[PDB]
Design a protein around this ligand. Structure first.
Ligand code: CLA
Ligand code: CLA
Ligand code: CLA
Ligand code: CLA
Ligand code: CLA
Ligand code: CLA
Ligand code: CLA
Ligand SMILES: CCCCCCCCCCCCCCCC(=O)OC[C@H](COP(=O)(O)OC[C@@H](O)CO)OC(=O)CCCCCCCCCCCCCCC
Ligand SMILES: CCCCCCCCCCCCCCCC(=O)OC[C@H](COP(=O)(O)OC[C@@H](O)CO)OC(=O)CCCCCCCCCCCCCCC
Ligand SMILES: CC1=C(C/C=C(\C)CCC[C@H](C)CCC[C@H](C)CCCC(C)C)C(=O)c2ccccc2C1=O
Ligand code: SF4
Ligand code: SF4
Lengths: 39, 740, 43, 134, 60, 139, 80
């Protein structure tokens, strides 16, 4: 019973996780915009 | 003392047992706590020895089980005859058998199967069969479809009677044990009636029906003009015109003036020149001779009237100096254990099926088989493969007898007891033969494969270079050529033209030809002996050491089928009698896979091929077997790479399905390696982490999942390994010959 | 009784066999009339 | 060691030179009746009326045989360890009671008061000669 | 824990770790691991029962 | 695309239409196939090359088949999950998996057409998933 | 040779002593109040490592554990 097998310490919104994820998602949309010649 | 005792209403006929699976055993009956229960439900279904200790219930289950099995075979045979009636080109095949291919299957006009329906002659677009049923029905004397239709219906009726019998003999009228133990009555009845009278009747059919029908159809008579079989019985003038022996009647038979029947009972001993096939008159003389022999042979045993032998007396009196008590105690084994009887009946029946394949190719016994090279290979291959499987089963049940039914009291200093005592000497010497043969038989290929690459053909083990001629087989061949007029004075021709004689050409194709044995055949016959000995080493060791070993003294209490006994003693893995059988099947495959290739390449190279009218034979590969079959690269180059061209290029044609299953078979073979190489210890851990995902999403199963057992993983592998292995050669042999 | 027979169909193989045959029959039915489809046609 | 050998003609499965060179074990037992019994390594033999003796290459052959004799209702089976110098020792029932049943003279050997789950991690024990299971 | 109570086992190196189970009985003695527990899911060997300590168990 | 052109301008597609290879019993199935295939783009080999880029012009290639699977697939999984959880409440759960209680299954099989609507309800709530402390995990 | 270690979770089934072919194991009493039975491994030289003891142990996981190690004529089961 040294290490708990389940993690702890996070709130519902998960702000830090979402901020970097949405950024990575934005680059993908940008490269897609270059593919469809939108830009 | 061979009475008929039958119990009244042993078990009901309710449907309730169908509802509850696992009624076999007390363990399975409890419940399916894990998924291994599912796999165990099947692996024990036909293992009646485990369900009940009462030997009566074992025999009653088995006797009824055979009846349901015969229903399956009869339904199968009836379906072949039915397909010959409706979806077939048989009626067109009779008019022009040489230039028309035989077909019995038609795919439907759907997504693109319809390409498989190809022009096989006779206005029929369908798949070309290789079973040879067309040659069988012709030899039976069937000349129209309705006559072929009636035979199919009788099989289905016959199927129901078998199916009714098993119900009748398990639910209503169950024999007791001692009814089964009357082996002396079993042998008289099977020898004289099933084999004797069954052959006797067929002699009546060949004489009345087949031989006149075949003779008229062979002499150029159109099928429309050929009379029906019933007319021969009523009108005897027809038979007298073809076979004048009937004019004398039955009086020469009883007065022993059997020379009058020389017209339709002969010893020509050769093939009919017009149709590649043995003379029907010889096949009539054939069955007549054997029925007398079987009918005589059956009366040996006693069967309630005091006249005959007790088989116990014959065995016990066959002792000797080197064997202490001789066969004392064996009769109790064969009568006590069903497994021992299965081992004998299955092993020798397997060897028959191989012997049958060998006699049939050299002596084609049906009309127009020899010209149909496709039907000969598929028949020769299928029978060898069947016999190979059965021989392996004989060793398995031999071990099951030793683990379960072997009693030391009965087998006390008998023949079996002594064999177990010196099992070490039997295997150590057999081991020496396997190494001796493997070095010599196969190493000589490596020497030729090495010397040819170095550029030293002078040093090869070839026909021009250093040569190993099979002088003994060349000599035994010569005697059979000179036996007609010599040691077989009443024989006109040699028994088979394979031993010698002259070329026989049915149409443009050659039916049979002398098979000259060179140095290449010397090596291959030892390769076959090599692979057979190792297969016996694996299987025989499985039988003797199934009960005990120096490594494991108590192997019986663990059972016949167990994976291991721990990682102690080094490693005790694959030590069971089951695991020996699992290994022998790979060698049975390697043993027989060379046999079909030795047959396929040699017959294509030396025997089969078109023959010119002037007397020149053009074989399919043109002597490729002599110089190339002495090296492994030749089998890779001239046999596998060359003959597989039609298979891969079959796409977009009627043979395209062969190229697919040829390809799909390679998948299953590799899919087998996933199970053989791997192990359960990995797979239960992977299923563990996958169960976590289901416990997360609440999709967890009630029946807890479990990886396949150890011996099951070996069982699944050899299943795929043989299925994907054999199916590859199946399509390779089909498509290569159907094009050629 | 009839209840015993219904449970036999309720088992996995007979239930799986009837369902997959009904499932397979629909696809073989559709490919018969409507022969070949690789994409939905575009209005 | 005193006893009659069970009567059997012989067998390749049996004692080898390891018996003479390194060690051989011998099992002894007493019977009420002469019966037939399967040997530990191949074959059958006829045990005599009383005081039977058999030499076995390994200890496993004897206890495996002892289980078979128990099915004949014989529990007075005893095993010895014979060294090449003739030294003999009472090996299997060192105490007269069988191993399954309890006796006061015995003591704990290789007992861990902890659970298997509480074993030390091996990284805590390296370059020391100690093993986790101690 | 009392008889008949449902408990989550916290002992690691166990098959039913972090899984509920009914307490069949308790041994009123000084033995380690006195509490007997029965679970629905069987282990690999098919035991369907094992003794456990009170500290490992939590009352669900 | 890579040397990718429409069908009718492609000469390779014009030749393949002649060699029909009629699949079904209909005699003109082969001609009707190549006729319907005119919409797709054909390369030099003459076979239609689908574009799974996501263009609305070519949704029939992948996007329309894509949605048709997931609606069917969620029907299978959601029905399986609900049927499994329903069995868990009853006494004998193991036997029900092998021998299907159709009285429980067929009502659940009837539902499932609106599997996303029931999914989002269990998604928003804790019904869909379970706590990590509840699940068994190796040490 | 091999080492057979026996842990606190023993309950006194005695099955480990029965399944053993080589009599490496012996049941001894406990001074404690737990039971009058504990498994022991007095003669580990005869241990061959066939893990039959670990198949007959009805614990959540093994109270009796067999750790492989150095080999000998006896542990390898060589009659030659
Ligand atoms: C007339 C209908 C009928 C009915 C109601 C029963 C009912 C019963 N029979 Mg019975 N039986 C029948 C006909 C019938 N039998 C016939 C015709 C035969 C002769 C073959 C037998 C031979 C027979 C034996 C030898 C035994 C029974 C037993 C039983 C009992 C258990 C069967 C069970 O639960 O498994 C139900 C099993 C099935 C429904 C599966 C049967 C599979 C069939 C037979 C073969 C199918 C082969 C197929 C073509 C393979 C294709 C493979 C591939 C395509 C995948 C039960 C009371 C057993 C018994 O009493 O147990 C103590 C038993 O040992 N029967
Ligand atoms: C060894 C047994 C056996 C096998 C493998 C086949 C195999 C076949 N039969 Mg067949 N058949 C058999 C025995 C067999 N038959 C017997 C004994 C009879 C007489 C009772 C028939 C009477 C028969 C007819 C009348 C027809 C077939 C047809 C077919 C084909 C299509 C099967 C189908 O659509 O399944 C459907 C499966 C289910 C509905 C389940 C297929 C090649 C059909 C065919 O080839 O048409 C061109 C067809 O019309 N069979
Ligand atoms: C007359 C023939 C015959 C008979 C009556 C038996 C009878 C028996 N065998 Mg046996 N056997 C035979 C031939 C025979 N065998 C042969 C030829 C071999 C060598 C291959 C074996 C090898 C063998 C082994 C290794 C074992 C038995 C065992 C048994 C017993 C239990 C089997 C069982 O529960 O069935 C149920 C069996 C199964 C459900 C297995 C199904 C295998 C499938 C059919 C393989 C797939 C082949 C198929 C053609 C592939 C194409 C179709 C597919 C793609 C859909 C039973 C007494 C077992 C035993 O211990 O006996 C006590 C056992 O372990 N047999
Ligand atoms: C090509 C693969 C292959 C080969 C070569 C072998 C070889 C062998 N297997 Mg085998 N086996 C294999 C695959 C193979 N197995 C697979 C896949 C399985 C799983 C089913 C098995 C399962 C299996 C079993 C179960 C058994 C064997 C047995 C045997 C032996 C038979 C004796 C023999 O032929 O004399 C030896 C012959 C050869 C090794 C052939 C080549 C030797 C050449 C000619 C000589 C080498 C030249 C030169 C000296 C090299 C010197 C180089 C220098 C620089 C060092 C032999 C060692 C049996 C056995 O051991 O009985 C004796 C046995 O019981 N095997
Ligand atoms: C295993 C089968 C086998 C056999 C039978 C041969 C045979 C031969 N090889 Mg060869 N070879 C083999 C495998 C084999 N090869 C393999 C696998 C390779 C690849 C590495 C080669 C590579 C190779 C090369 C590169 C060359 C040969 C050559 C030769 C020839 C000369 C042999 C020699 O000098 O040895 C002499 C042999 C001996 C000294 C011992 C022979 C053992 C005797 C016969 C034992 C008899 C036992 C007796 C009967 C028992 C008595 C019983 C008692 C009671 C009395 C000879 C024809 C040479 C050549 O040019 O060929 C013409 C050569 O240059 N070999
Ligand atoms: C990766 C696996 C995979 C995928 C994605 C597909 C996908 C497809 N296959 Mg294919 N196929 C597969 C495996 C696969 N198959 C396998 C394993 C084989 C056999 C070895 C085949 C053999 C095959 C053939 C022979 C044919 C297809 C066809 C098709 C296409 C039309 C299917 C159809 O009519 O929908 C079903 C029809 C509907 C209207 C949808 C209705 C949905 C439900 C049932 C309504 C309720 C489709 C693109 C056909 C094609 O390409 O035609 C152009 C065709 O003729 N396939
Ligand atoms: C979070 C959801 C999400 C969404 C909505 C998208 C959306 C998209 N991804 Mg994408 N992607 C995602 C997660 C997501 N991704 C993740 C988690 C990964 C890591 C595996 C990727 C890796 C990925 C690759 C590697 C590519 C896309 C591409 C694309 C675009 C496909 C073209 C189109 O719109 O039609 C589209 C904008 C493609 C694209 O934009 O190519 C130009 C492309 O090549 N995605
Ligand atoms: C980049 C922003 C500068 C780093 C800011 C930084 O490292 O601070 C880290 C800071 C820490 O928030 P936490 O709540 O994790 O702090 C946890 C402490 O309470 C632990 O005791 O998070 C944010 O700044 C949230 C906003 C970042 C949003 C990132 C998405 C935008 C990407 C561009
Ligand atoms: C030598 C012929 C066997 C002659 C033969 O078996 O002798 C038979 C001889 C006869 O002893 P009995 O007269 O006691 O046998 C009486 C029988 O009725 C009892 O089965 O017994 C022996 O000497 C045992 C030797 C077996 C082991 C002999 C070696 C066998 C080698 C393997 C077979 C090689 C076959 C090669 C040709 C295909
Ligand atoms: C893969 C593999 C496994 C794992 C293999 C498994 C678990 C096979 C599972 C087969 C089927 C697919 C399980 C599920 C059957 C379902 C009933 C199918 C769903 C019903 C629909 C199809 C109708 C072993 O257990 C194993 C053991 C020993 C040596 C090698 C191996 C090995 O290689
Ligand atoms: S738990 Fe294992 S070691 Fe303890 S008594 Fe039971 S079988 Fe023996
Ligand atoms: S591994 Fe073998 S010798 Fe060791 S304790 Fe277990 S059963 Fe006994």
């Amino acid at each position: 019973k040294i290490s708990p097998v389940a993690n702890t310490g996070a709130k519902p919104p998960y702000t830090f996780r979402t901020g970097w994820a949405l950024l990575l998602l934005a680059v993908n949309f940008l490269v897609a915009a270059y593919y469809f010649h939108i830009i | 003392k061979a009475r008929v005792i039958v119990d009244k209403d042993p078990v009901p006929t309710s449907f309730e047992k169908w509802a509850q699976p696992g009624h076999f055993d007390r363990t399975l009956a409890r419940g399916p706590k894990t998924t291994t229960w599912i796999w165990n439900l099947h692996a024990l279904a036909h293992d009646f020895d485990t369900h009940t200790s009462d030997l009566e219930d074992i025999s009653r289950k088995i006797f009824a089980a055979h009846f349901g099995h015969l229903a399956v075979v009869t339904i199968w045979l009836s379906g072949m005859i039915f397909h010959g009636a409706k979806f077939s080109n048989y009626e067109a095949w009779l008019s022009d058998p040489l230039n028309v291919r035989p077909s019995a299957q038609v795919v439907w006009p759907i997504v693109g199967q319809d390409i498989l329906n190809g022009d096989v002659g006779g206005g029929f677009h369908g798949i070309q069969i290789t079973s040879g049923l067309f040659q069988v029905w012709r030899g039976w004397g069937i000349t129209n479809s309705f006559q072929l239709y009636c035979t199919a219906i009788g099989g289905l009726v016959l199927a129901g009677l078998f199916l009714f019998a098993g119900w009748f003999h398990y639910h209503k009228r169950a024999p007791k044990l001692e009814w089964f133990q009357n082996v002396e009555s079993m042998l008289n009845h099977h020898l004289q009636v099933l084999l004797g009278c069954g052959s006797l009747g067929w002699a009546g059919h060949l004489i009345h029906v087949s031989a006149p029908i075949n003779k008229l159809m062979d002499a150029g008579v159109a099928v429309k003009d050929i009379p029906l079989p019933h007319e021969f019985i009523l009108n005897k003038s027809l038979l007298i015109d073809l076979f004048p022996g009937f004019a004398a009647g039955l009086t020469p038979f009883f007065t022993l003036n059997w020379g009058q029947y020389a017209d339709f009972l002969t010893f020509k001993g050769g093939l009919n020149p017009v149709t590649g096939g043995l003379w029907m008159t010889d096949i009539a003389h054939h069955h007549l001779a054997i029925a007398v022999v079987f009918i005589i042979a059956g009366h040996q045993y006693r069967t309630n009237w005091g006249i005959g032998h007790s088989i116990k007396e014959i065995l016990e009196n066959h002792k000797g100096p080197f064997t202490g008590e001789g066969h004392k105690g064996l009769y109790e084994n064969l009568t006590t254990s069903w497994h021992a009887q299965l081992a004998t009946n299955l092993a020798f029946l397997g060897s028959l099926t191989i012997i049958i394949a060998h006699h049939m190719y050299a002596m084609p016994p049906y009309p127009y088989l020899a010209t149909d090279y496709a039907t000969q290979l598929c028949i020769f291959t299928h029978h060898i493969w069947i016999g190979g499987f059965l021989i392996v089963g004989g060793a398995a049940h031999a071990a099951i007898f030793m683990v379960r039914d072997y009693d030391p009291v009965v087998n006390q200093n008998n023949v079996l007891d002594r064999v177990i005592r010196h099992r070490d000497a039997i295997i150590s010497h057999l081991n020496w033969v396997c190494i001796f043969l493997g070095f010599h038989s196969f190493g000589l290929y490596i020497h030729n494969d090495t010397m040819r690459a170095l550029g030293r053909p002078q040093d090869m083990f070839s026909d021009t270079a250093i040569q190993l001629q099979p002088v003994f087989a060349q000599w035994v061949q010569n005697l059979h050529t000179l036996a007609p007029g010599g040691t077989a004075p009443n024989a006109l021709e040699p028994v088979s033209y394979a031993f010698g004689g002259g070329v026989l050409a049915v149409g443009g194709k050659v039916a049979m030809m002398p098979i000259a044995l060179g140095t290449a055949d010397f090596l291959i016959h030892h390769i076959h002996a090599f692979t057979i000995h190792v297969t016996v080493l694996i299987l025989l060791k499985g039988v003797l050491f199934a009960r005990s070993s120096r490594l494991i003294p108590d192997k019986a209490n663990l059972g016949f089928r167990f994976p291991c006994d721990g990682p102690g003693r080094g490693g005790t893995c694959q030590v069971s009698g089951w695991d020996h059988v699992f290994l022998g099947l790979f060698w049975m495959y390697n043993s027989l896979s060379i046999v079909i290739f030795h047959f396929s390449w040699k017959m294509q190279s030396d025997v089969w091929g078109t023959v010119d009218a002037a007397g020149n034979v053009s074989h399919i590969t043109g002597g490729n077997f002599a110089q190339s079959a002495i090296t492994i690269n030749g089998w890779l180059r001239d046999f596998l790479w060359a003959q597989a061209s039609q298979v891969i290029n079959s796409y977009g044609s009627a043979l395209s399905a062969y190229g697919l299953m040829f390809l799909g078979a390679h998948f299953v073979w590799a899919f087998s390696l996933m199970f053989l190489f791997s192990g359960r210890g990995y797979w239960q851990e992977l299923i563990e982490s996958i169960v976590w995902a289901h416990n997360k999403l609440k999709v967890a199963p009630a029946i807890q999942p479990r990886a396949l057992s150890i011996t099951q993983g070996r069982a699944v592998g050899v299943a795929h390994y043989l299925l994907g292995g054999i199916a590859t050669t199946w399509a390779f042999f089909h498509a290569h010959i159907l094009s050629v | 009784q009839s209840s015993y027979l219904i449970k036999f169909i309720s088992t996995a193989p007979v239930a799986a066999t009837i369902w997959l045959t009904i499932t397979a029959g629909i696809l073989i039915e559709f490919n018969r009339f409507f022969p070949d489809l690789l994409f939905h046609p575009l209005p | 060691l005193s006893g009659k050998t069970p009567l059997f003609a012989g067998s390749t499965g049996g004692l080898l030179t390891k018996a003479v060179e390194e060690e051989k074990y011998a099992i002894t037992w007493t019977s009420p009746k002469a019966q037939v019994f399967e040997l530990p390594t191949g074959g059958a033999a006829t045990m005599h009326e009383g005081e039977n003796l058999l030499y076995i290459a390994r200890k496993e052959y004897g206890i495996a045989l002892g289980g078979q004799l128990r099915k004949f209702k014989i529990t007075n089976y005893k095993i010895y360890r014979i060294l090449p110098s003739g030294e003999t020792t009472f090996i299997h029932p060192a105490d007269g009671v069988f191993p399954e049943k309890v006796n006061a003279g015995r003591e704990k050997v290789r007992f861990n008061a902890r659970s298997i789950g509480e074993n030390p991690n091996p990284s805590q024990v390296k370059f020391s000669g100690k093993a986790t299971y101690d | 824990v009392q008889r008949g109570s449902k408990v989550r086992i916290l002992r690691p190196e166990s098959y039913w770790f972090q899984d509920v189970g009914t307490v069949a009985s308790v041994d009123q003695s000084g033995i380690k691991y006195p509490v007997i527990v029965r679970f629905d899911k069987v282990n690999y060997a098919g035991i369907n029962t094992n003794n456990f300590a009170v500290d490992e168990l939590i009352e669900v | 695309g890579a040397d990718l052109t429409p069908c009718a301008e492609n000469p390779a597609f014009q030749a393949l239409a002649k060699n029909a290879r009629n699949t079904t019993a209909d005699p003109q199935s082969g001609q009707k196939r190549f006729e319907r295939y005119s919409q797709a783009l054909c390369g030099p080999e003459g076979y239609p090359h689908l574009i799974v880029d996501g263009r609305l012009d070519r949704a029939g290639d992948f996007l329309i088949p894509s949605i048709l699977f997931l609606y069917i697939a969620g029907w299978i999984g959601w029905v399986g999950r609900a049927y499994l959880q329903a069995i868990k409440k009853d006494s004998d759960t193991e036997q029900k998996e092998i021998q299907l209680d159709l009285g429980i299954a067929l009502p659940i099989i009837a539902t499932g057409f609106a599997w996303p609507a029931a999914a989002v309800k269990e998604l928003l709530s804790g019904e869909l998933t379970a706590k990590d402390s509840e699940i068994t995990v190796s040490p | 040779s091999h080492t057979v270690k026996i842990y606190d979770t023993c309950i006194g089934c005695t099955q480990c002593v029965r399944a053993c072919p080589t009599d490496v194991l012996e049941m001894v009493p406990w001074d404690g109040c737990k039971a009058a039975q504990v498994a022991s491994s007095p003669r580990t030289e005869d241990c061959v490592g066939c893990k039959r003891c670990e198949t007959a142990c009805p614990t959540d996981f093994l109270s009796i554990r067999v750790y492989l190690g150095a080999e000998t004529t006896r542990s390898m089961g060589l009659a030659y």
